[PDB]
């Protein structure tokens, strides 16, 4: 989608706010939001691409100034409601309850061994998105290609600042889950993946740095041949 | 930035806290989240996985040209040699700083970062200020925000992680460090030198 | 600039909030913000293009959800500080004072006849931006042209959704003040002005309506010839 | 839309009010703003200039084909025939709805609107929801937000006012109105029919 989350090349957003140091987690609530990512993925709330798409559908004023891990909460709520795993009205009543009783206990529950096995397996082993496909790669290192001008209304990895631009394939990485389908509930449909190089003057015009290039990863349907 | 519409930070923190505890109590009741799951996940990335892992790969590449060639051929397989890998680093591609080229990394779409070598990213990396401006004005950004002046004759290469390929910078070995141990070299490899916003430490 | 204010084609911003009726001014403060536009233009705070540029430099979360006439206040403050016509610290002290004494009087002052003559002359006579130039028009009705891909960091009228796109000149209107110079303190430097037509499929790809076109006004330097 | 960061409307109104009165007191003291200037400007656009002016041009064009040709040749000069013109309507271009074409108007960059024929615009026209979506999904927007179903065979032409040329829609004359007076016809011309979000009123 053409969401404001896609901020590459956006002007006017301000200076960087960077403390000299910071903890991994700035408040207990961030640990909770972070651990919910594997909990919610295993329960079938959504996929990695759907995860991104729910952050992208946020209120953009909210997206632009909220603490980062609040984006994760939003996408949890979004997919819980859509799959009916989360009753929004019960969520509201609970929020009020904990506004007024912030130290109130959590509900009682069994600890689950398998949720720890899953955490340890994902973290150390990985959740790879590489896939085998039957078709061979359309493109190869050194081919000159042009990024699509398409503007899908659903989830896609098509930063507005690379659409219509011309680059050189630099590396073929194999095939991977295609976000244009996976993030819209349409399955993995894996596609061959490429790193394409763009000069800054191709991207920004004469306002681009004369000695700078940007490498952006494109799935095969994102690009078509200009020159071998 | 000033926003006359925005509540105070304290008001915002109180509201998120109550909303997060509400969601937490619902997932817990539904069997899918537990308190041990939260502590296990937090304890990995507070204590186990961090930039010191990536430092280990950098100094082996500095002191072993065969590993360096393998690290640049396939960063995932090479890091596995040191037992380093896993979630959000399934596909790593390392890029070498030279006298001619400087590399810097970003996720303009969200916050992609090679967790297994760097840990979780700092907040400025995930926030719109750095993300928006790095692909468009890398040189001025490295100067103004990081005090790192990259000569205009030197190419700045910016790597946007639009896919699951994670990009990590191999910084240049500082001068004045001939024969240093891997442990002594490891003190010059910062998180920032592996994003490309800073070089490795001098001296 | 690539500001989020340039919202043509942005997805995810939500349903329209439209009451069945509303007054011209929803609160006295909006009348004040509105009347400040001629007061501030006559005093030399800024020009019409500079006016727009100061709204465009707003905090975008603030821009996206504030009452409209607050954008005008922001651009007044921006140009007052830049020209030193407004002491920001005195503005802050006054704001606190009126937070606590909202009915406190305004400062005493002469009424000015000439400020009423100016209001009446601008409103009924106009403040036209048409200009004569010595050069003839490069383009003409029916010429096929391509919008620039340039991305100036300063004020310009180059909506991100038309950059790089191909259209047909439909009308030449004459020459007018050029915003790329006027809005950046570089003078009127007027340029010939054209309405160019773009198909929705040229603009959005296959997601565009098959029976829709968009007409966007381009100053001469914005477009170069493809076909007569 | 929900924004957990945003103060209440009442809190926002109180803060803007104090900020506007602060700025007002400074301009007043500096000689450049007065209270009579505020009332004069407000009274023009609350009482004098409004959509009824544009209605007058529409019904003359409906009932006089020579004026209509001149209105489409040069909207500014034609409106001057009825003494209608001035600020933010120095350059008007009127566009005719037909059985084949529907026109709708927007300023995607801010809030440009032909003030002398329409008055000041309503807030939804100036706000990001309409501005963002009209150029991209005009047909679905006219249906969902205005209950106006434009057949897919009918071309929708959207006019973005990136320059000072102001665009005004001339809506189609409703059937069932042969011989009506200019005053009777004038009751069917809405503000919305001159933006293109609605047709003229039926019956
Ligand atoms: Co990311
Ligand atoms: Co406007």
Residue numbers in the entry:
A (entry chain B), C (entry chain B): 1 to 228
B (entry chain A), D (entry chain A): 2 to 204
How did the manuscript describe this experimental structure?
Nitrile hydratase (NHase, EC 4.2.1.84), comprising α- and β-subunits, is a metalloenzyme that catalyzes nitriles into amides. The NHase active site contains either a non-heme iron or non-corrin cobalt, buried in a deep internal pocket, similar to most enzymes in nature. Hence nitrile substrates should pass through a tunnel to access the active site, and rational tunnel engineering might be a plausible choice for NHase substrate scope modification. We rationally refined the tunnel entrance region of NHase from Pseudonocardia thermophila JCM 3095 (PtNHase), based on substrate access tunnel calculations.
Two successful mutants, PtNHase-βM46R and PtNHase-βA129R, which exhibited high catalytic activity toward bulky substrates were obtained. To understand the mechanism underlying the expanded substrate scope with bulky amino acid substituents, the crystal structures of PtNHase-βM46R and PtNHase-βA129R were obtained and analyzed. Both structures had clear electron density at the mutated sites. The βArg46 and βArg129 residues were located at the “upper entrance loop” and “lower entrance loop” of the substrate access tunnel, respectively. No interactions were observed between β129A and its surrounding residues in the WT, and the side chain of β129A was also buried and oriented towards the interior of the protein. In the case of PtNHase-βA129R, the side chain of βArg129 formed a salt-bridge with βAsp49, which maintained the side chain of the Arg129 outward offset from the substrate access tunnel. In addition, entrance shape and size analysis indicated that the entrance of the PtNHase-βA129R was expanded compared to that of its parent enzyme. Introducing β46R and β129R mutations into PtNHase resulted in an 8.2-fold and 4.2-fold increase in activity toward pentanenitrile, and a 6.2-fold and 8.3-fold increase in activity toward cinnamonitrile, respectively. However, the PtNHase-βA129R mutant lost more than half of its initial activity, suggesting that it is a stability–activity trade-off mutant. The maximum entrance sizes of WT, PtNHase-βM46R, and PtNHase-βA129R were estimated to be 39 Å2, 47 Å2, and 46 Å2, respectively.
